[PDB]
Amino acid sequence: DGRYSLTYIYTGLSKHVEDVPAFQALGSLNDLQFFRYNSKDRKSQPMGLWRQVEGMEDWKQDSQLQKAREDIFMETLKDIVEYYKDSTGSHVLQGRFGCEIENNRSSGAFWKYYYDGKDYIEFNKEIPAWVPFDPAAQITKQKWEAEPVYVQRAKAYLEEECPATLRKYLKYSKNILDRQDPPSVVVTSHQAPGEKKKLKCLAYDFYPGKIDVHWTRAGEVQEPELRGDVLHNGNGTYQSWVVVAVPPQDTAPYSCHVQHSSLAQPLVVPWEA
Ligand SMILES: *[C@@H]1O[C@H](CO)[C@@H](O[C@@H]2O[C@H](CO)[C@@H](O)[C@H](O)[C@H]2NC(C)=O)[C@H](O)[C@H]1NC(C)=O
Numbered sequence: 001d002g003r004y005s006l007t008y009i010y011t012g013l014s015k016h017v018e019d020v021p022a023f024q025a026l027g028s029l030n031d032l033q034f035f036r037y038n039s040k041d042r043k044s045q046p047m048g049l050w051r052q053v054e055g056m057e058d059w060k061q062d063s064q065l066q067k068a069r070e071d072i073f074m075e076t077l078k079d080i081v082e083y084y085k086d087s088t089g090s091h092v093l094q095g096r097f098g099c100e101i102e103n104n105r106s107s108g109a110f111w112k113y114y115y116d117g118k119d120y121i122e123f124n125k126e127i128p129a130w131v132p133f134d135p136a137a138q139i140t141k142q143k144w145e146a147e148p149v150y151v152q153r154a155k156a157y158l159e160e161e162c163p164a165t166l167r168k169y170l171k172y173s174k175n176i177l178d179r180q181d182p183p184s185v186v187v188t189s190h191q192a193p194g195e196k197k198k199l200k201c202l203a204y205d206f207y208p209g210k211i212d213v214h215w216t217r218a219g220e221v222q223e224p225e226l227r228g229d230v231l232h233n234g235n236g237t238y239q240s241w242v243v244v245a246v247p248p249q250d251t252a253p254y255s256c257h258v259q260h261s262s263l264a265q266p267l268v269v270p271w272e273a
């Protein structure tokens with residue numbers, strides 16, 4: 001088994017502008033986003049390859065949970081703004097929470113909030129208790145620990161519930177997170193009126209993202225003139241390209257080299273002028 005992480009991020013705005021939802025939420029499994037929810041549509045929706053997955057989660061019921069989460073999250077923001085007596089201002093509250101496993105063993109967990117970009121409050125499950133960083137967080141802490149069970153629930157979420165949700169999602173995400181999709185490659189050239197010829201090597205449709213893409217000139221690795229990559233979440237695939245400029249009088253042989261974890265051995269794709 002390897003490393004898997006479940007991460008949630010909540011964003012609330014005290015005074016949202018037109019077309020921007022007051023509350024937004026998203027969730028990721030490793031490097032991919034699997035769902036989103038906002039206060040406009042009010043519905044938890046799977047994303048990317050999880051749109052094709054059935055039975056992993058009941059989105060209609062998750063929509064109800066997120067609405068409940070939303071209500072408490074925004075009330076927290078509302079209380080902070082009230083404490084500073086600045087409702088006329090535009091403020092933001094962001095919350096991050098989740099856990100991770102490695103070798104089927106819980107290896108991490110976190111739960112922290114940020115107010116206007118500054119650390120606000122975080123849960124330390126070893127105590128177990130919330131740790132305030134902002135003066136208003138002292139009030140929030142008081143409310144979140146009003147009854148003995150509250151901290152017990154928080155500790156249980158990070159230590160029992162979250163990792164159980166991750167293990168469950170992992171059972172339906174094998175063909176997504178554990179894929180070893182080999183890259184397709186395409187070498188292309190372009191001549192700019194007045195500029196040198198440029199050779200572009202593109203590796204696409206691969207996963208995981210880690211990859212080695214480079215050009216060679218007469219068996220000599222070259223220094224790229226332009227480089228880049230991207231991850232398409234809808235697809236769960238990456239693309240990575242490298243570009244080199246070639247002297248107008250150069251005749252040497254140019255070939256692209258691609259090495260990836262999914263390949264038995266590296267691939268070579270010479271360019272035929
Ligand atoms: C996964 O999604 C990406 C992004 O939509 C696809 O890339 C596009 O593919 C079409 C058709 O091949 C091209 O016309 C576009 O130019 C590509 N988008 C760009 C600019 O990267 C990709 O083909 C998809 N791969 C799979 C396996 O479905």
Ligand SMILES: *[C@@H]1O[C@H](CO)[C@@H](O)[C@H](O)[C@H]1NC(C)=O
Nearest residue numbers: 001101103104105106164167
């Ligand atoms: C860990 O993986 C084993 C099988 O490899 C599985 O039976 C178990 O439910 C998983 N998590 C734990 C420790 O319960």
